[PDB]
Design a protein around this ligand. Sequence first.
Ligand code: HEC
Length: 108
Amino acid sequence: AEFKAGSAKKGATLFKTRCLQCHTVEKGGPHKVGPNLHGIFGRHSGQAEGYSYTDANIKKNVLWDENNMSEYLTNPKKYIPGTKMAFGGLKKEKDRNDLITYLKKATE
Ligand code: HEC
């Protein structure tokens, strides 16, 4: 994928309505169904302290950035086979760009 900054505003709504049930973004935020995402863009997959990852997510060992995050969010199970993230993906590129524009800011 090739990330292009979009609407952080739309991204925030997308996170709230598509991700928040399983993820928090704030520093010190709790793990829920999925791991807290604070600092995700300075980290490899499967490395958030305090979260119980699948071996699949850990072994993928993807150094998260705006580009492979877009690739991942297109189809998480195709990108990380065996992951337990029950999310089909954001198929529209503009949605992924919006979400990641927000996530880059929100997870710092
Ligand atoms: C529950 C129903 C989830 C929804 C909705 C979303 N995610 Fe998720 N995510 C979930 C789990 C259980 C996991 C761990 C998977 C595993 O195999 O252990 C994840 C993982 C991620 C990651 C990787 C985090 C890391 O490696 O530290 C990312 C970057 C991520 N999820 C992002 C994300 C976004 C942006 C979502 C909304 C669009 C989203 N997830 C939905 C559970 C669930």
